Amino acid sequence: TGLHFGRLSLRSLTAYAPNLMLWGGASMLGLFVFTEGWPKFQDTLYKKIPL
Amino acid sequence: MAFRKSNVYLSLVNSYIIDSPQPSSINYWWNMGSLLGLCLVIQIVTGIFMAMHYSSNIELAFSSVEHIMRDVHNGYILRYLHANGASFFFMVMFMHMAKGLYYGSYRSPRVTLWNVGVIIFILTIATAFLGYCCVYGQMSHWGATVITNLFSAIPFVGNDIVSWLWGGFSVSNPTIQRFFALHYLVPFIIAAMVIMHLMALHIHGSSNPLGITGNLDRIPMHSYFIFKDLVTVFLFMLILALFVFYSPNTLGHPDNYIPGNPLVTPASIVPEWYLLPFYAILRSIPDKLLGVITMFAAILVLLVLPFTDRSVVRGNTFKVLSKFFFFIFVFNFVLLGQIGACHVEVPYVLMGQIATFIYFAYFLIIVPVISTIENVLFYIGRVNK
Amino acid sequence: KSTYRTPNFDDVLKENNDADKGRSYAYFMVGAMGLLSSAGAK
Amino acid sequence: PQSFTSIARIGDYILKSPVLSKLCVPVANQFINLAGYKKLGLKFDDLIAEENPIMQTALRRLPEDESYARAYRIIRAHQTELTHHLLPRNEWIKAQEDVPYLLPYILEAEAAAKEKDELDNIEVSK
Amino acid sequence: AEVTQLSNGIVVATEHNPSAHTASVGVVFGSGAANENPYNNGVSNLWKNIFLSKENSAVAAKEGLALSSNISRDFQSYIVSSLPGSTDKSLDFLNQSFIQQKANLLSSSNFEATKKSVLKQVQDFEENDHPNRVLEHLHSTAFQNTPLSLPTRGTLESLENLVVADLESFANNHFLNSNAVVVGTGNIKHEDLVNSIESKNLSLQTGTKPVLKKKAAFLGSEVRLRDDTLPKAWISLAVEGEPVNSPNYFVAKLAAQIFGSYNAFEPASRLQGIKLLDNIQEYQLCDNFNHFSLSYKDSGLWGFSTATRNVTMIDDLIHFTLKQWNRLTISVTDTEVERAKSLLKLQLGQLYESGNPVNDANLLGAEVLIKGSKLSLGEAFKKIDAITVKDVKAWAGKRLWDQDIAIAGTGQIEGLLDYMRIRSDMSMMRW
Amino acid sequence: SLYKTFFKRNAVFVGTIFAGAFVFQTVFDTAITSWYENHNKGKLWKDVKARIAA
Numbered sequence A: 001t002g003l004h005f006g007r008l009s010l011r012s013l014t015a016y017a018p019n020l021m022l023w024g025g026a027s028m029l030g031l032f033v034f035t036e037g038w039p040k041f042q043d044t045l046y047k048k049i050p051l
Numbered sequence B: 001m002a003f004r005k006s007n008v009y010l011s012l013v014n015s016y017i018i019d020s021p022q023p024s025s026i027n028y029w030w031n032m033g034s035l036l037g038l039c040l041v042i043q044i045v046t047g048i049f050m051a052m053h054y055s056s057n058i059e060l061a062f063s064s065v066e067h068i069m070r071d072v073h074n075g076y077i078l079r080y081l082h083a084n085g086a087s088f089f090f091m092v093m094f095m096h097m098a099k100g101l102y103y104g105s106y107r108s109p110r111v112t113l114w115n116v117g118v119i120i121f122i123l124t125i126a127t128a129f130l131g132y133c134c135v136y137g138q139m140s141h142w143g144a145t146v147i148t149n150l151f152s153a154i155p156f157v158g159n160d161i162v163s164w165l166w167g168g169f170s171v172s173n174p175t176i177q178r179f180f181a182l183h184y185l186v187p188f189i190i191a192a193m194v195i196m197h198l199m200a201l202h203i204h205g206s207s208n209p210l211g212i213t214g215n216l217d218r219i220p221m222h223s224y225f226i227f228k229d230l231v232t233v234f235l236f237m238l239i240l241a242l243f244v245f246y247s248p249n250t251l252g253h254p255d256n257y258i259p260g261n262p263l264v265t266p267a268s269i270v271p272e273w274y275l276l277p278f279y280a281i282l283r284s285i286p287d288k289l290l291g292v293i294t295m296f297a298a299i300l301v302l303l304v305l306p307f308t309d310r311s312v313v314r315g316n317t318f319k320v321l322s323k324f325f326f327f328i329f330v331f332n333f334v335l336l337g338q339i340g341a342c343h344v345e346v347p348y349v350l351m352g353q354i355a356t357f358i359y360f361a362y363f364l365i366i367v368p369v370i371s372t373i374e375n376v377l378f379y380i381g382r383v384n385k
Numbered sequence C: 001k002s003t004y005r006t007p008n009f010d011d012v013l014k015e016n017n018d019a020d021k022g023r024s025y026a027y028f029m030v031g032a033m034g035l036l037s038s039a040g041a042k
Numbered sequence D: 001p002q003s004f005t006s007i008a009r010i011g012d013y014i015l016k017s018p019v020l021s022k023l024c025v026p027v028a029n030q031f032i033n034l035a036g037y038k039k040l041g042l043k044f045d046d047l048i049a050e051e052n053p054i055m056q057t058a059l060r061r062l063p064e065d066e067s068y069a070r071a072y073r074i075i076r077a078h079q080t081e082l083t084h085h086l087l088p089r090n091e092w093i094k095a096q097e098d099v100p101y102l103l104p105y106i107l108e109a110e111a112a113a114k115e116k117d118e119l120d121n122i123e124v125s126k
Numbered sequence E: 001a002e003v004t005q006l007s008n009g010i011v012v013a014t015e016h017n018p019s020a021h022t023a024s025v026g027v028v029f030g031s032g033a034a035n036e037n038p039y040n041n042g043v044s045n046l047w048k049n050i051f052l053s054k055e056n057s058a059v060a061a062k063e064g065l066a067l068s069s070n071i072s073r074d075f076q077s078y079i080v081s082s083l084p085g086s087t088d089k090s091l092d093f094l095n096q097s098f099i100q101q102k103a104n105l106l107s108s109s110n111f112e113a114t115k116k117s118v119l120k121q122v123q124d125f126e127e128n129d130h131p132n133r134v135l136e137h138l139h140s141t142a143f144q145n146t147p148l149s150l151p152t153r154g155t156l157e158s159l160e161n162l163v164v165a166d167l168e169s170f171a172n173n174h175f176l177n178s179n180a181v182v183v184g185t186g187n188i189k190h191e192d193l194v195n196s197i198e199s200k201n202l203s204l205q206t207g208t209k210p211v212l213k214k215k216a217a218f219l220g221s222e223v224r225l226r227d228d229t230l231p232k233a234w235i236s237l238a239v240e241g242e243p244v245n246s247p248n249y250f251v252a253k254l255a256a257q258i259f260g261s262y263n264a265f266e267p268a269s270r271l272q273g274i275k276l277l278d279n280i281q282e283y284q285l286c287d288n289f290n291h292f293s294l295s296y297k298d299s300g301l302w303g304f305s306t307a308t309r310n311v312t313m314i315d316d317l318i319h320f321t322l323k324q325w326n327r328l329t330i331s332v333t334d335t336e337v338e339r340a341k342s343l344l345k346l347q348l349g350q351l352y353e354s355g356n357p358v359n360d361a362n363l364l365g366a367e368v369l370i371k372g373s374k375l376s377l378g379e380a381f382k383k384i385d386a387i388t389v390k391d392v393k394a395w396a397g398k399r400l401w402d403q404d405i406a407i408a409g410t411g412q413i414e415g416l417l418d419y420m421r422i423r424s425d426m427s428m429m430r431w
Numbered sequence F: 001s002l003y004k005t006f007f008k009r010n011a012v013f014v015g016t017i018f019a020g021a022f023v024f025q026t027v028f029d030t031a032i033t034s035w036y037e038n039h040n041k042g043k044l045w046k047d048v049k050a051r052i053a054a
Ligand SMILES: CCCCCCCCCCC(=O)OC[C@H](COP(=O)(O)OC[C@H](O)COP(=O)(O)OC[C@@H](COC(=O)CC)OC(=O)CCC)OC(=O)CCCCCCCC
Pocket: B027, B028, B029, B088, B091, B092, B231, B232, B235, B236, B239, D084
């Protein structure tokens, strides 16, 4: 009847982690905004139809 | 109430340098903070009055420094105070951080104070490096080249970062001009971080060399620590006056009076004297990327310090083994500086690697293990069963 | 006049509240401002 | 950050073993009288840092007379460290007076906080 | 236990408790405070107090009959308690009190004395009972310009305009056949009560209470009754809750039960298993609070009322309470749900199965007026056992996560901030 | 409730903001360049390069 804790709970960690993956996704969308115009990233950044 | 308490402006002067309750047992090692403040004011005032005569073009930098040292009235005083005071600024800052490590001022509730201190340390290293590159001597040019190629080690992005830093393709006129602008700028960020440092200090007060509370016997700031700081201010100005007026070019490197030549590489490229332990840490790793990561980790490992000190008493005053291994660490840091000043030769590579390992082992293995053993030894020394 | 008799708000209330419609329109407009602010900051 | 239950467990494992006690209790009290907190007129429970709420609790727990004695030992230690001298040999804390007086208050606050954290993170017996 | 029910136009619903020593018998009407226009407001309170009038209570007490009454938002009740051998006497008294005549209760002297007494009681409620008048203003501003906003107690400006004609008009429009349930709880049998009602006639009226034009609709608002000459700061705060006959009834009550109630002066109340207490006990933010899940016929309320003396840290109280409310949508644990199950079983069995028969009569009358039959407690415990964490998260996302709130406060509520920061604190911005 | 789950989490909200800002920068740059060239047809340098064919 214990738990794996370090003041943060393992239940709490699995409760927040399906949102933390979306936080990583929105941060990658933020980098994809702020890093165009940089011609090194444009080897990857224009592929489908921004060209 | 009094006017120093009821006025809005003088209440800060009151609550910081007049009626601040200081612990009445602090020795002269709690004076390096006031000494760093005085030396920062020295650096800024000499920087302004010497940057009224400085032209930051790459073809006119070294000639303008020599114009300061020759044609400007008392300009040799300004430049010699400025360079030797930067050396004393790092020496007093090293002594201040050693006071922090020794007496346990990094521990709770002063973790915010320690982190703002590490931020001030990084910004000061940046300021000194930029101002040393503003001279544009031989060492200035080639040190700027080596540090920015170290920034080119970053994977998939780094070459464009370095072409952004240089403003060109090598260390040229835009590089020296932007280093002068940044070097004028970053000390005011250091002043703002110092004000934030004083706030994070003032919310809990200073420590004391015993590691117990000091809430019982407080004495005010005014006249007591004012005149104690005045004692060390006059001693600091005395030693600075010696190394300015009688032997000014001792701490510097004589290659910095050769003008900046991109074609001739020097026989031994060495930074100024205080960045040598970090240069040795970086030179000890046989990889560029891991070298840069290890050089920045050698400062972030000061941030991981309050979480590894498992000693239940504050400070190394009343502990034997922690005090011994502290002086092992201090003389190891001096040995890092002296390894870095040498060439890449047998056996200085192996000694640089061992010395870097003992640096990181002190911050990550030696402190928690020795603190745990010292705790258990304090317990079983006096508890009988 | 009692403190239980609320005064007239009927000229300025929505005729239909529908608490997903109003919050969706408000978040659409705030999101459009954040959109153009992200573009301008970039 | 040693969590006094842990240091008490290690120290009791050393003391209850005869070989380990016979080996490292002379090392222990040699470490104590080389530490030199006695010479300033202090006890070791006067030396534990008290700027965390569990030790602050264990200082509220303490009786009055021991609290006034602890306050006097702190003020005489600050004054003796200020003069850069030591207390005379008649005023040093002897070995019998170095009693772990604050240890049981600290240990009961440790057990209380540990039990609160465990009960704050329980499962249910399904 | 068992609840039976029969009909002849009236509805007879009982609870034969053979272990009890009394027997409550009374009529529970289906009109309440939510069936009044704002100009005859308080007429139900005035019927309560002419039924509990001195002459009527004296004639009741001659035979050993204690009277009781209750005015709620949905239901009135008029309960007569007696010994278990005097159920015929109680029925004949209730017959003579309402059905056979009302003019002797509605004489001039009795009506004027009762109007004076209720005007005194409403003024005493208005200027001395602070958390209840906060909750009444919370209803008056959550449901405003809508008949569920009217207070059960009535207002001083309306109640001094009532005359006997309004009492009789309300009686003719609301004391009807289909509107009423005659309730017998305690130590009486169902067959005895039905045979004794059929032994008499006891026909209240023809029937058909007027239908309200406007249904209840929640409206996020606030009202601030700031009085600086009071020692505390009372404040209620609620969202639109669940009405009765909703599938989210027990889920809304268990959500109220998760954060429970608290009293800062009781030692066993400071040690509860609520994660809000770790934030609330450090700087002593409040003296007490309670989370309520009020459920009416058309709508409901879910929120908390509180009182505090730390008038400079009211916003921290609201802040930590609402962040705990936001924990229901995102990350409520299993142990909090199990604890709320056990505590809600406990307080629900204390509420429905206390020893007092008049409270059983009020509850049974309300429930068989609204939903036609009383849900017994074993099926209620099965419905509480059927709730999972996903049900609570779905309900909190439907009703709590970024929904409008209604706020009422009095006392020293200057430390309470604007509406918009309290509204914007309903969603965390971190999820 | 049809769009509110698209606005409920703040993660997907700011992800929508950044994706739409990316698309807006690309489309708005291309559209304003095309309109500014169309409004000044016959004056830009590629027009004179096409006319002067020598
Ligand atoms: C290198 C360039 C740095 C430039 C910075 C300039 C300032 C240098 C600061 C050096 C320093 O702060 O060390 C402080 C160290 C500890 O001090 P303490 O409080 O434990 O001693 C109490 C004192 O008896 C009270 O005695 P009192 O307070 O009455 O006078 C003190 C002394 C002032 O001297 C100093 O401040 C340091 C030289 O007055 C004199 O009598 C001087 C006689 C000529 O003083 C000592 O007692 C020495 C212990 C060994 C330290 C060696 C340092 C090697 C790095």
